Amino acid sequence: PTHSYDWLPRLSKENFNAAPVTCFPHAPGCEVWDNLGVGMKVEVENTDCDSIEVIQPGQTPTSFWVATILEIKGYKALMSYEGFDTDSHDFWVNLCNAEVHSVGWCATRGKPLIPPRTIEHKYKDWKDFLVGRLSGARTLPSNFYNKINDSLQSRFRLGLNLECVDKDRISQVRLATVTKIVGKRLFLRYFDSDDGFWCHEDSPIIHPVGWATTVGHNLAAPQDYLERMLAGHEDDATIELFKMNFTFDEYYSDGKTNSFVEGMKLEAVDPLNLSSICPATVMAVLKFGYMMIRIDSYQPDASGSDWFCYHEKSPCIFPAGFCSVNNISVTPPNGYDSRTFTWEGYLRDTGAVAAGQHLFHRIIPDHGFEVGMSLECADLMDPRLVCVATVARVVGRLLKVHFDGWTDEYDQWLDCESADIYPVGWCVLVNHKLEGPPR
Amino acid sequence: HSYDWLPRLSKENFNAAPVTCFPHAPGCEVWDNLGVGMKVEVENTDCDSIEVIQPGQTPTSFWVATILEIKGYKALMSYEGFDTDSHDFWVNLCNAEVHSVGWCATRGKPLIPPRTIEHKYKDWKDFLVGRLSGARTLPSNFYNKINDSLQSRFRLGLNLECVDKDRISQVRLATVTKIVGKRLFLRYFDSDDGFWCHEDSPIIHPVGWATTVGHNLAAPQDYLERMLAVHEDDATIELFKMNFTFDEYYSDGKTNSFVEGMKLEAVDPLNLSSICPATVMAVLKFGYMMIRIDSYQPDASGSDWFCYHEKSPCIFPAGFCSVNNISVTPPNGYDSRTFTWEGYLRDTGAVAAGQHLFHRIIPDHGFEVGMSLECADLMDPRLVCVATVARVVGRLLKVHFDGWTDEYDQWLDCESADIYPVGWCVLVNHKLEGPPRVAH
Amino acid sequence: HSYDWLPRLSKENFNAAPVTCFPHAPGCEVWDNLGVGMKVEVENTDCDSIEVIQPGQTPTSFWVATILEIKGYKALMSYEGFDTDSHDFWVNLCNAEVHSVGWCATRGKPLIPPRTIEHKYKDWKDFLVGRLSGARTLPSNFYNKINDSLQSRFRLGLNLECVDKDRISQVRLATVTKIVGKRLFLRYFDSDDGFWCHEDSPIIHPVGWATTVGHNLAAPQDYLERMLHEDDATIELFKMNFTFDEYYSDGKTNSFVEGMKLEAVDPLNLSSICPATVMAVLKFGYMMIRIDSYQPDASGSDWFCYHEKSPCIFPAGFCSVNNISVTPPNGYDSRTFTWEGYLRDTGAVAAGQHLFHRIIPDHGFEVGMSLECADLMDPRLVCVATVARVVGRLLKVHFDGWTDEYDQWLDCESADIYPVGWCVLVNHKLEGPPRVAH
Amino acid sequence: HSYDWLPRLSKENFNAAPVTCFPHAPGCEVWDNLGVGMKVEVENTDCDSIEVIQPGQTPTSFWVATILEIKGYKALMSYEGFDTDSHDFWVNLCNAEVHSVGWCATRGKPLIPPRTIEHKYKDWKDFLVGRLSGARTLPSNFYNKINDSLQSRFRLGLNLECVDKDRISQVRLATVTKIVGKRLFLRYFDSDDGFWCHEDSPIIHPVGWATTVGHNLAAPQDYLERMLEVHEDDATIELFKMNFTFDEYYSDGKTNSFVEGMKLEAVDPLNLSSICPATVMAVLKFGYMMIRIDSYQPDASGSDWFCYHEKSPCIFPAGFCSVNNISVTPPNGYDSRTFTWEGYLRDTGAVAAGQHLFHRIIPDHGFEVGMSLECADLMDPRLVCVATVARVVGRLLKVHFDGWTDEYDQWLDCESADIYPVGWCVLVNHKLEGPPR
Amino acid sequence: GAMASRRWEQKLVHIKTMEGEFSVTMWASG
Amino acid sequence: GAMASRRWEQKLVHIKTMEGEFSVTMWASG
Amino acid sequence: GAMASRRWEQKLVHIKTMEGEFSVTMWASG
Amino acid sequence: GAMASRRWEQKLVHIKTMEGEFSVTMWASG
Fold first, then answer.
1. Chain H nearest C-alpha distance from E22 (Å)
2. Touch between E and B (at least 3 CB pairs under 8 Å)
3. MBT repeats at which positions (chain C)?
């Protein structure tokens, strides 16, 4: 095992602000999280007692006591054992990793509750005290951790084949296979190489078998697969496994669109530099709403190898002027300066037209993210890493996420429903290493 | 002069109990229609009278803002178009001219940019569309819903039975002569005295309550004669809040739970900072009973006996304070050192009321130690004051008045009708007492 | 006298539209708190006056019954304790003395067994516990909620602007002089004449509406002057299926245009849907149209205002697509009418499909369902009626005992249709089916 | 052959209990996403093979229809464009090719008009836009949800403990060998014999149940030794339906409610048409208890004792039949016109179980007298039969098999796992027994 | 919060007759 | 928060015929 | 039935300034 | 129908200590 960052010192400070689990729709436990609450009672590991309990062989060796939940920060909960007069023995736990149960769980399994050593002297029979503390009090539904467990599972399984954006040539998707899964983040190994990359199952850059051929996107794959496509298997990743904010019913059968047109300009998050929002150009309109765009800040390149596919309903494309309207420093197009750039002048220089506002459909939900909230965030440029992070800005439904201890040059513009952000404690829950602030 | 919360709101980490913590508070049931990040039309305090105002209509000019924070009824607003927070401002959500976006246009009113930023654009259309498209705003019926929740169940002139503040062992006939934020001013008959009381308070009762229950009653002669033998101004049962129904009792109201002589713990009705051992002195009908606080001086008259219903959240089994780390007020003749319930029971030869006689459910009320709120002074209920949650014990709260000694603290249920969100006084036009100023 | 539904109720397979089908009907929002099989305390009509009654209290003695059926506001009651159904009885749920079980005991009233079965037990406790334990009954606030839902938003004495039945192209000032079940009688300012209409009707408007929208107005001189008071019926009393937020501040629209053709229910004949023409586009979505089947008339006295979001206007082709016999334009045959030919003849264009926005709710109305329906041509009357056709959200309503010539086209959310038993509830007379003479 | 509901559906005023009346029935939880008046794409049975079908896909051509009626799983369809009802047709909603409108286009399939009306339009766009705009159709995931709800919690090869039909006072080890619509065939361990029962039946139990509860158990010696270590084929606790939890009882399962000797009434497990006085013979753990039906001929062996849980909906306080006008079955040696509970308790010197020991809540189950449904013959659970709700007594149903005498009527709780909506047999591929000749 | 109004509730009610009075546990929606 | 699943939703769908293809806006319960 | 009031709804509103007037599509809780 | 799952429920649980076993009535959301 290696050194993973423990949130403990942050949790121990006053006014630590963590984005709650319910801010993350894809996070395990999100849908049942409102079954938890400060003030509720649980049975939890007694770390302050001798092994006086006769443990049945095979069962848990742990002895339990009751505690009140005082605080909830992401997946973290501050526990206080019943019977303690001060907070000296309060302790933080990982709610979905620790031995935590509804009150009554032990008795059903013939286990007695053992008072901690520090307070064991207070009563001979703790019955009256416990009745007093627990009567009418809230506890967990008996099915809570079953629901948690269910929400841990990926829609994908090992060995599935899918089409994913080639990190070495983002203008094409390449056939890949799922070789590892951690917290629904898939490790995808490309065929015809030994290379690969991590990405969450909900990421917009992975697609089902047949997607590229159907949509008209560039495809690299083994010859056998290529041959199967041009005509028109147990390990195919199919459409129902993939998250979409639209349906194909919304499009004509042939996928022919008449919205965005080649040559139109707009703004977009740079897929190769998430700290950048930049003017971009529609280079090729594909089918079913998908289109290839070029980030205008890139160096001149006629090959088109650096073109990138965004769907027309992506929350990461914006109309020209989005940065200006929202006080965001726009990355100027190649050959321009931040001061010497205006959209009006740029359009005249290039003789181009900006995509109309009506082509973008953005709804701002009450996502609940606030500036200064702590969370865990994947590094999109090195998706092996999930790191300590802070919400630096909220711009409608768009977040600027800052990595604690790093310069702002490594910030990432991410949608509030990004699958690359996670609650505090997620890394511990799913057994992923958490990168802390650098030295 | 009423206290403005502004200096408290201006502090980082100001912790106010949200409106949803208060079931009886105006706006509680529609408070989820609000949210941080939402857009509203709000008064522009930074412009000239360039808007031609129709006489009779509001002279106010408006702009659009985003809600950054909500603390009780207070909202921190930030005008659209500002690059800094230097002009952010607090408003009373339900008092200030705050509206859904679109409100002005429907009334023919233009939006006027604050002077600080007015030259940023010529036509603000593209900016406003950019900022407001797909954004949340107020539902159009929001303030209609708020207005509905402001109305008291009671009207002026109603007659009711209320605990006599000069002799708490009896109720006395009183009439409602004034209503402020559902707090009723009750004027006793056969005198010129009275007191303030929220409509949901447990110490007011419908006409005929005392006679039915068997509680002591003082009233004009005509009323007493009617009681032993329904008028237009009778306050009837449906106007009163109860945590039970009379269906739960037999028709004659005969109970078999608490028994005369049983001991328990209770909040002292004459000193709310105190929870003390108490004795059941007389069991009335329909769950009601007269108890006596054991810390009082000896008195055989029973003028100091007080009625609690058996389902009151302000009575507790013996040992409640001890189990919950509360310093109990010892009985007459005992010390915080010398007092234990076991010793006390042996000395008096008494029996404690069983735990099963008490029924408490602990809601996820959301109150936390340190939260600010507004609280009525039960000893001088004219006053509603700046307050802070000092303790949370299950569903029981200890409320502290900022700037006062702990001698004036009050033990109150989490659903007490005497606690209100920050901003309530402004909403209902009640004066708010701020913390007293320290002399030296 | 008023028609009683009982002969219909007593037949097997009587299909009444439930109260929940009528959004405007009293009790609609709390109706799901009722259920077949539930228990209630109800008037005992079969007992001697053995119960000592207190002054001021109801003189009625009660027993317990099971609800066996619910048809509109009607409910079939069965007293507990009988061996046969021969004493089962229909009641008006919101008129009869009905209570949750437990209501009497709280008031010191004993339950009294009907004389027919009184000797079955000495002490009825064991029987009643056996029958009522775990059973459903009414929520205690049920009839409070019903009573609240009975009240009109209007009061006597309010003045409003309403369509002149003598010249439908103008509205005329009128006063609310009577209210029956939220149906208002509006007496015109200059006359003893007037008409009935429900408070939710689209042909009544607040003071100032005509002036603001640009509609013709007949009114007293001083009123006209004031437009260009405590008894003013104001905006919030009126039901709209849109908001003014949806329109520009000046109400200028660019949807329907003068000359456009469409289809519409004839305001002068509800049995008829006819091609129609936009004659004048007013403000805020309101427009004057003319029914094309009318005899030639250049006065414009017969123009009628429909708001653009009215469920009673349709795109050209609506009748044809839905197998509805269209009432032809003046000088045309019904069976052979085509829009293609008609548009060619007149050189006009049809209003586009995008100008209409019809959504079809699961309203729950089915062919053959019984209900009560106002006679739109004589709105004093509310009559026995049946759903003859369901066309999307549009209903063809047949008056029982009349020929199909008298059928009316009504939207599923029309305020002129009511549940079986409504007339009894609100004390309105119900017109029964005319008797067949031979 | 299997009975077809078709002639009954074709009658006016055919009353079928809706799917939502059956909590265990497939599709119950999503059924409210259906409604009369809604539009669907459905098989065109009135056209030539003019559509070019891609290999590997359905050869079926589709048109659009309105749902006119829903009776259990059955739906009455009417093709858009027909002026009369002459071509209206019934379908099995969860078997036939039925989709949301839009399903065909996404798969590149054209809608083809029925030949009968094909002449009406050259281009059907205007007609279809006029008819379908703003109209209700199916959620795209409807039949996925139906499919999920079809699956049993059990698999083949699972071992469980179930009531011995040859000796109902003991449970017997058995293996699931067949599953038809969540009805399991359980083959006894030491035999070729077995029986059918729904997965939610109260007479099947997980491995270890009898030993935990104290119920008689017939099993190989190796099994009992193990009970006094989990095997892969063990049917475990979470696979079984219970209307209570073990948290409600003390750890040792000791109860103090029903006591030996107490009398009550109960449905005869050997004769579902009979409700009879019964006696508590043995109180077990966790609320379970052995009772004997008092109508049985005298038998000191106790082989005919039957286990009911205390929260069973099939036991009642003494006087239930009297109070509810039900013909009670007299105890052995009594007459149905002479027997009274007061006389019985006098003769035997016994005490009736108190009302407080029983807890019946009466849901708004929605079953009404005259409603049609499909019902298993509990005496021969191979058979599911045409049936009718004869009586509703609170939450208890008297179910009648159409065409047979009343002697075979069954008393069943409204939440019984043995009753199913009209069309269930077709959906599930179970044979439906019709009325006899 | 989580603790709020429920769709249906049990209700303890009483029934009085000329022979005496007793309680019955029933239920109601809303 | 407030922005969550709704009881019913409009849905844009398409219909193809031998003569062409077009869109229709309908609805379904969620 | 299924078609009833929803948890949240889009709403078209208008904004007037001294330069003109335009529409905006926003949303609000029920 | 009107009788379905509710947002929260009381639950009877048990607690065992070295001195004996007893029950407590609590609640949980569903």
1. 26
2. yes
3. 3-114, 122-220, 228-329, 337-433
